[PDB]
Amino acid sequence: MVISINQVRQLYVAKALKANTAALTTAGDIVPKADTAKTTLYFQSMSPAGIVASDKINLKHVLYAKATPSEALAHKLVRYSVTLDADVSATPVAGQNYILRLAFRQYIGLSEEDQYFKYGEVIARSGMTASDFYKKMAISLAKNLENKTESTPLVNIYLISAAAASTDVPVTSATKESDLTATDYNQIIIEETEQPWVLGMMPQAFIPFTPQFLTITVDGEDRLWGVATVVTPTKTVPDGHLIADLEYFCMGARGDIYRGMGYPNIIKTTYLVDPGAVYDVLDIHYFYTGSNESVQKSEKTITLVAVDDGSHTAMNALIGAINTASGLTIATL
């Protein structure tokens, strides 16, 4: 997952905050060192093979410094709520073909010009109510979408009971309509899902969609049988797959650029970011200016990730150590 830069960007994980150089003993500690005049800030960390320091940040030359919480990097999975169109008919008409088309836009492609379409079909019956139509549509949608012989997961189908109105009833291919026993269904929640992730090789990306309907001949007029509105999202993808890709890119500015390439004949970097844990990112952006003629800047930055547990305990102590040492005004989150 390659990220653009103003100029080079170095990441230092902060698993634990120590107060002096001699306590840096295990892989992942950190200590923000500074002077008594606060004219130079730098960061000592303990890598798997020794204490290393960062670049020396001249504190007169800071551009911005901001710490971002873990929730701001969580991708909200967009949910679509498919209801029957009340202007056409709130009840299913007898004998018309109800087809739903899902218009996927970035499937196995980097562009919107690579598109994919999945269908779900219900021929309505005579005594088919609104709840029995949503019952058989989610069966027919999940039998096409969430089959096990699909390459990548696309969306998830969720039924909503009207008495519940806040609990999603999951409909998969293995689910029969015998297990869907409620008699009050009012919408079909269609929610996108997480694409697979490996660090460095495959980025964290998502496939979008829009549910589109085909017209039914109700009273001699071809009318779209449903509407497709987007409700507020409920599930979030955690920050562990972004930061484990974010550290992998900044481990070529310090470490090796030939990561794994001539495979037995490499140097192998130990990455100290857990891919299954959330993190808080502090971006310290600065530059360097030369003496007389080299007033042109080299706008570089140092970033810091620290794992937090609900209330951000580890990051707000890391900001609390930088503000006393460096004298900065980095706001706490």
Partner 1 sequence: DDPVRNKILHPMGGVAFSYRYDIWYIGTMDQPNIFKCKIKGDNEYRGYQW
Can you give the binding site for a second copy, defined by CB under 8 A? 198, 201, 259-264, 266, 268
Q: Which residues of 86-118 are buried (b: 16+ CB within 10 A; e: fewer)?
A: eebbeebbeebebbbebebebbeeeeeeeeeeb
* Interface region with partner 1, contact rule CB under 8 A, candidates 74-82, 106-114, 238-246, 276-284: 106-114
- Binding site partner of 201, from partner 1, a second copy, none, Cβ cut-off 5-8 A by kind: a second copy
Q: How far is CA 310 from the centre of its chain?
A: 18
The least CB distance from residue 173 to a second copy, in Å, is 17
- Give 144 or 215: the residue with its C-beta nearer to partner 1: 215
CB of 212 to partner 1, least distance (A): 6
Distance CA(291)–CA(235), nearest Å, equals 52
Judged by CB under 8 A, which stretch of 75-83, 103-111, 126-134, 195-203 contacts partner 1? 103-111
> Is residue 184 classed as helix, strand or coil in its secondary structure?
coil
Closest by alpha carbon to 281, among 314, 311, 254, 253?
Answer: 314
Q: Count the neighbouring beta carbons within 10 Å of the beta carbon of residue 62.
A: 17
Which range, of 13-21, 104-112, 241-249, 266-274, touches partner 1 by CB under 8 A?
Answer: 104-112
Residue 259 makes contact with partner 1 by CB under 8 A: no
Stretch touching partner 1 by CB under 8 A, among 99-107, 122-130, 150-158, 240-248 = 99-107
Taking the least distance from each CB to partner 1, the nearer of 109 and 196 is 109
Q: Binds 40, which of partner 1, a second copy, none (CB < 5 to 8 A, cut-off by type)?
A: none
**Is the Cβ–Cβ distance between 31 and 24 less than 8 Å?**
yes
Rounded least distance, CB 287 to partner 1, Å = 18
Rule CB under 8 A: say whether 103 interacts with partner 1. Answer: yes
Task: Give yes or no for residue 118 binding partner 1 (CB under 8 A).
Answer: no
Q: Which two tokens stand for residue 139?
A: 């069966």
Which sign, positive or negative, has the C-alpha torsion 246, 247, 249, 250? positive
Residue 262's binding partner among a second copy, partner 1, none (Cβ under 5 to 8 angstroms by kind) is a second copy
Residues 221-240 that bind partner 1 (CB under 8 A): 224
Site for partner 1 contains 7 (CB under 8 A): no
How does DSSP assign 42-58, residue by residue?
Answer: EEEEEETTEEEE---B-
Residue 103 interaction partner, one of a second copy, partner 1, none, beta carbon < 5-8 Å per kind: partner 1
Please answer whether residues 332 and 317 qualify as being in contact, where contact means their C-beta atoms are separated by less than 8 angstroms: no
Integer Cα distance of 223 and 95 in angstroms: 15
